């Protein structure tokens, strides 16, 4: 389990509220405020989910072998409604659960501002919005298209050797779509307001 995690008293799930002004809080706050400096942060919580982390690290080791190099991982944003937060904290991201123009997967934004739209981070009855900071195994990617259920093949002559993810634009990506469980680890939950 990672260094920066705090002790869980032999439990396998904890949401840990970060201390404002310490290094970890400042790093995550800066990634958000790059594009969302007009929003008010109520809190940032570290997601310590041992089972999700295990399953994700296994996928990461496998993708590092398959792709014959590292650099398979990116930090991305995911806005969601308050009713989905408990599910994501416990079970992560489920493609089976908005527009799906680049395929039937889970969508992650490069910019917090994109995930901050009310259609994604729906304001709850008290006006609070929720956005995850997500470790995503984007790996080797191609342009997506409507109706994909998995990424395309890297060569139609080996139809089972797939891209790891798809994007809106391969030269200047602003979103990524992954199509498999455990390709995304929800690392921080930001609670914020307009």
Ligand X SMILES: O=C1N=NC(=O)c2cc(OCC3CC3)ccc21
Residues near ligand X (CB under 6 A) are 77-80, 98-99, 101-102, 107, 109, 114-115, 120, 175
Backbone phi and psi for residue 50, each to the nearest 5 degrees, phi listed first = -60, -45
CB of 100 to ligand X, least distance (A): 7
Interacting partner of 180 out of a second copy, ligand X, none (Cβ under 5 to 8 A depending on kind): a second copy
> Residue 80 and residue 145: Cα distance in Å, rounded?
23
Interacting partner of 114 out of a second copy, ligand X, none (Cβ under 5 to 8 A depending on kind): ligand X
Cβ closer to a second copy: 127 or 159?
Answer: 159
Cβ closer to ligand X: 26 or 101?
Answer: 101
Backbone phi and psi for residue 181, each to the nearest 5 degrees, phi listed first = -60, 150
CB of 7 to ligand X, least distance (A): 31
* Binding-site member from 9, 21, 22, 65 for a second copy (CB under 8 A): 65
Dihedral sign of CA atoms 46, 47, 53, 59 in order:
negative
Q: Which two tokens stand for residue 154?
A: 């890297």
User: What is the SS3 assignment for 183?
Assistant: coil
Q: Could you say whether residue 59 binds a second copy (CB under 8 A)? A: yes
**Residues 44, 22 contacting (CB under 8 angstroms):** no
> Residue 105 and residue 97: Cα distance in Å, rounded?
9
Cβ closer to ligand X: 64 or 124?
Answer: 124
Cβ closer to a second copy: 123 or 153?
Answer: 153
CB of 3 to a second copy, least distance (A): 21
> Residue 76 and residue 174: Cα distance in Å, rounded?
10
Interacting partner of 159 out of a second copy, ligand X, none (Cβ under 5 to 8 A depending on kind): a second copy
**Residues 145, 113 contacting (CB under 8 angstroms):** no
At which residue do the structure tokens 């455990």 appear? 182
**Residues 85, 152 contacting (CB under 8 angstroms):** no
- Footprint of a second copy (CB under 8 A): 12, 51, 54-55, 58-59, 62, 65-66, 86-87, 89-91, 94-97, 104, 149-150, 159-160, 162, 179-182
């Amino acid at each position: 389990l990672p260094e920066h995690w705090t002790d869980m008293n032999h439990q396998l799930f904890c949401m840990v509220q970060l201390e404002p002004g310490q290094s970890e809080y400042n790093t995550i706050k800066d990634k958000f405020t790059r594009t969302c400096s007009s929003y008010a942060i109520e809190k940032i919580e570290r997601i310590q989910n041992a089972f999700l982390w295990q399953s994700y690290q296994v996928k990461k080791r496998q993708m590092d072998i398959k792709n014959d190099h590292k650099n398979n991982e990116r930090l991305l944003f995911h806005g969601t409604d308050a009713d989905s937060v408990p599910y994501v904290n416990q079970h992560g991201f489920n493609r089976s659960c908005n527009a799906v123009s680049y395929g039937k997967g889970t969508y992650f934004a490069v910019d917090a501002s994109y995930s901050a739209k009310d259609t994604y981070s729906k304001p709850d009855s008290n006006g609070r919005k929720h956005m995850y900071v997500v470790r995503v195994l984007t790996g080797v990617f191609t342009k997506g298209r409507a109706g994909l259920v998995t990424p395309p093949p890297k060569n139609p002559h080996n139809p089972t050797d797939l891209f790891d993810s798809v994007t809106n634009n391969t030269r200047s990506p602003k979103l990524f779509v992954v199509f498999f469980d455990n390709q995304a680890y929800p690392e921080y939950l930001i609670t914020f307001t307009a």
